[PDB]
């Protein structure tokens, strides 16, 4: 029951992940951070524009194989 997920950044980068549709996405978010050198209070994970909570699963977000998660940066103004 694995799924493939892409994580796309403001730099155009793309990173692939396998994850079970019912594991919480916190392990992918923490994996993606450590791998890219990112600070997780400075970036935001979004699927179809909706925020992703640590506890959320690919299942309860209704993701499918090869769907894309976007990562955005802090904005101030």
């Amino acid at each position: 029951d694995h799924i493939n997920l892409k994580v796309a950044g403001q730099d155009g980068s793309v990173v692939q992940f396998k994850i079970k549709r019912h594991t919480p996405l916190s392990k992918l978010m923490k994996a993606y951070c450590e791998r890219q050198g990112l600070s997780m209070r400075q970036i935001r994970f979004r699927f179809d524009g909706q925020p992703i909570n640590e506890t959320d699963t690919p299942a309860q977000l209704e993701m499918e194989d090869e769907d894309t998660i976007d990562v955005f940066q802090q904005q101030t103004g």
Binding site: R41, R44, D48, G49, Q50, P51, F72, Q75, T76, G77
Partner: protein
């Protein structure tokens, strides 16, 4: 709607600059309160539509019929600055609000293209034409260099609850405090 980390809330503190978590969370509160009438796009929508076109924001309206709403609010982020685009569906008028007189009509055309595209996919013939730019109107301007986010959120509250701009620069400290408490409660405390 949900609760913010204490350091995001802190961007409301004093004369700190509001960040995207404050903007987007208050948007959530606003359309939590009048959901049949207002749709609030988050502050990442515009950059995404601009750098990746309709195909990059197509799925963000997956659960929304934009065209049953009365008011779309779209916060615009410009480097160091917060501004606001609004779409009133009844009369097809796209407006640009900014608390420092900045004119960026260059980006309300991106919005117009977006709306005509969405209307095509959602099989909405009544919205394949007719969009106007808004005739600019006197709205309350800021007198410091840090309250643009606060002004933008107050325009949103007023437009959403259909109130007049009955505020000025001297109210901003109180509004920073009101927005703060509304955020801790996850509800608009009218």
């Amino acid at each position: 709607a949900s609760m913010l980390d204490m350091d995001d809330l802190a961007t409301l503190d004093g004369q700190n600059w509001l960040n995207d978590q404050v903007i987007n969370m208050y948007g959530e509160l606003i359309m939590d309160a009048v959901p049949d009438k207002v749709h609030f796009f988050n502050s990442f929508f515009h950059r995404q539509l601009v750098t990746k076109g309709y195909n990059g924001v197509k799925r963000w309206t997956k659960k929304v019929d934009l065209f049953k709403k009365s008011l779309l609010l779209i916060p615009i982020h410009l480097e160091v600055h917060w501004s606001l685009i609004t779409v009133t569906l009844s009369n097809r008028i796209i407006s640009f609000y900014d608390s420092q007189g900045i004119h960026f009509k260059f980006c309300v055309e991106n919005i117009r293209k977006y709306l005509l595209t969405e209307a095509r996919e959602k099989n909405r013939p009544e919205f394949l034409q007719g969009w106007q730019t808004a005739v600019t109107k006197c709205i309350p301007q800021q007198k410091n260099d840090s309250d643009c986010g606060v002004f933008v959120l107050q325009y949103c509250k007023c437009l959403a609850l259909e109130q007049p701009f009955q505020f000025s620069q001297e109210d901003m400290p109180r509004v920073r405090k009101r927005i703060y408490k509304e955020l801790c409660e996850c509800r608009l405390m009218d």
